[PDB]
Amino acid sequence: YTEIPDIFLCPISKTLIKTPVITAQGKVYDQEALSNFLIATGNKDETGKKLSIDDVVVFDELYQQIKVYNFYRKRE
Numbered sequence: 001y002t003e004i005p006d007i008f009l010c011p012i013s014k015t016l017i018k019t020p021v022i023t024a025q026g027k028v029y030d031q032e033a034l035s036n037f038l039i040a041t042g043n044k045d046e047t048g049k050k051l052s053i054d055d056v057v058v059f060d061e062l063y064q065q066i067k068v069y070n071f072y073r074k075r076e
């Protein structure tokens with residue numbers, strides 16, 4: 001599997017997450033992808049529900065796991 005682990009996938013950018021943010025609903029996106037996407041739809045997420053970039057936090061644990069993935073990845 002050269003493929004990116006699914007938990008590190010952003011539903012919007014559809015690749016690797018650079019910085020995980022998590023919604024109150026518990027959904028995980030890449031920060032910059034979500035920000036920009038939410039501007040395009042006008043605070044609606046990819047299933048058309050209301051969402052603001054102000055109501056997300058960085059997902060610290062997962063950010064950390066991503067850094068480790070990145071170590072193993074960029075090794076090859």
Ligand SMILES: [Cl-]
Nearest residue numbers: 007061062065
């Ligand atoms: Cl996790």
